Design a binder for this molecule. Sequence first.
Ligand SMILES: *[C@@H]1O[C@H](CO)[C@@H](O[C@@H]2O[C@H](CO)[C@@H](O)[C@H](O)[C@H]2NC(C)=O)[C@H](O)[C@H]1NC(C)=O
Ligand SMILES: *[C@@H]1O[C@H](CO)[C@@H](O[C@@H]2O[C@H](CO)[C@@H](O)[C@H](O)[C@H]2NC(C)=O)[C@H](O)[C@H]1NC(C)=O
Ligand SMILES: [Cu+2]
Ligand SMILES: [Cu+2]
Ligand SMILES: [Cu+2]
Ligand SMILES: [Cu+2]
Ligand SMILES: [F-]
Length: 497
Amino acid sequence: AQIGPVTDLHITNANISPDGFSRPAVLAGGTFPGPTIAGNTGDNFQITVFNDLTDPSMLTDTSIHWHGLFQKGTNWADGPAFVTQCPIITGQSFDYNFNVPGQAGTFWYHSHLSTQYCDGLRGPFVVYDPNDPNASLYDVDDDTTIITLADWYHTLAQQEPIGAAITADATLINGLGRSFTNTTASPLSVITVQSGKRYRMRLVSISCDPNYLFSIDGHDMTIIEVDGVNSQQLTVDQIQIFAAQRYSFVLNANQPVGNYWIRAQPNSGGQGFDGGINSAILRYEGATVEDPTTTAPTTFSNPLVETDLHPLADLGVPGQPFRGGADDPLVLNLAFANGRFSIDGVSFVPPTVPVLLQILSGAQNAQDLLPAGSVISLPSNSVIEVALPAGAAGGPHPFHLHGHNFAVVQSANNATPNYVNPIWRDTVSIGGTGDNVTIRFTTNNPGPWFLHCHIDWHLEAGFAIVFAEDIPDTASANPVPQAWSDLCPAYDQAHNI
Ligand SMILES: *[C@@H]1O[C@H](CO)[C@@H](O[C@@H]2O[C@H](CO)[C@@H](O)[C@H](O)[C@H]2NC(C)=O)[C@H](O)[C@H]1NC(C)=O
Ligand SMILES: *[C@@H]1O[C@H](CO)[C@@H](O[C@@H]2O[C@H](CO)[C@@H](O)[C@H](O)[C@H]2NC(C)=O)[C@H](O)[C@H]1NC(C)=O
Ligand SMILES: [Cu+2]
Ligand SMILES: [Cu+2]
Ligand SMILES: [Cu+2]
Ligand SMILES: [Cu+2]
Ligand SMILES: [F-]
């Protein structure tokens, strides 16, 4: 029941009750989470998105981002509203037609208009590798081995009151889970395994906000992929996974036939597992159909620490092995005050004309681009370093860069940089007060690429900038289809702009 790489995808409103509480939602493919979109490395995806939304309480416009896919030469298909396109209006459709050369791994898709993905438009996106170097580590890798972690809110995203704290009402694992308050014994998700087999579990955070402490009672987890990047095998018994991150791990079904709790503890909202909140079930074939009776340890033996991860391939680190050892070394001042986030003193407010369209129309330096102060040019064919020192309220903030993955030269909670063999990924926690999480990449992908905190509430409140990478080559690199050119006139007509 995976769809793609060529598929329609209808975006609708419907009622759902994933924790026993009914509310309206914004859904892809009629379900929460949406159906898995899948193909093989190098495939041409043609995802024709039909906007059938009618309920303005969750916005009737939409735009979809394919998280972690580089979109080289297809910046117009990336999805962030007012960065690479105007939204699709209701009753219209749009073909996101792109290729995935050189990528294979676990991704996801989500609305990238306002906080709409929180209202339900989120699902997995898997690019399989027919020649996967990790293939011999497991037996089973299919739709039944994808594990999504989601925060779910009873209050609609657009209706979250100004000046009140936002927390979720349930953790959903594979779309099901129980509410933190007024808990009812609604169905839990079951992940089924066969004793003796090995599974590539593809763990996807589709969170709007919390990070999760993920574990499986009685089991350990051997990480083999991080945000699309193959890793050396790293065995852990708990994974702290931040919004929008992905891991693949090998699960060896090597415990007695039985039932085992799957745990996903968010950093906000309900604490613990009373009444079966924050829980799913790992069930072995032949086990009794009943809840697990297992318990977690008080202290985990081998939690994931990001500096323990290393690429499977020899990826290195571009630039020179010291702070500022890049062609374009940046240090961002990341701040929060009075309900708004800012980067270098500027709070992101989406522009009327998408950044890409501004560039195609001839705006040719970043000082000419709107929003003023929110668009930073990057030079072509250059090593970029971005230091992201933490401290802003609401952390730990998982920062994400479109169009690229990056070397994590410095991770949370550890002052030592790694210029030799750090993991590469696309979403990274910037940690806690005094940290200096730092990323590096090379600019080989012309176009405007969003950089933002992936806590969606923080993005909405301004925690973003756009890197206008290689402005001079953006138009030649990214020819645009007529349907894309039609988006802004249709949107602005519908909204009387
Ligand atoms: C994080 O690392 C960056 C460099 O990657 C530091 O930036 C330097 O900051 C000082 C002022 O604090 C400037 O004088 C330097 O020009 C900056 N660049 C360098 C040394 O390469 C930054 O201070 C670090 N931040 C924290 C909080 O540790
Ligand atoms: C803090 O981060 C550093 C840098 O990633 C880690 O240092 C590496 O540790 C490994 C394992 O012992 C050594 O092989 C490397 O040579 C170290 N690299 C550097 C540059 O020092 C360190 O382990 C991390 N600290 C903790 C507690 O995990
Ligand atoms: Cu994303
Ligand atoms: Cu993205
Ligand atoms: Cu944030
Ligand atoms: Cu984004
Ligand atoms: F992305």
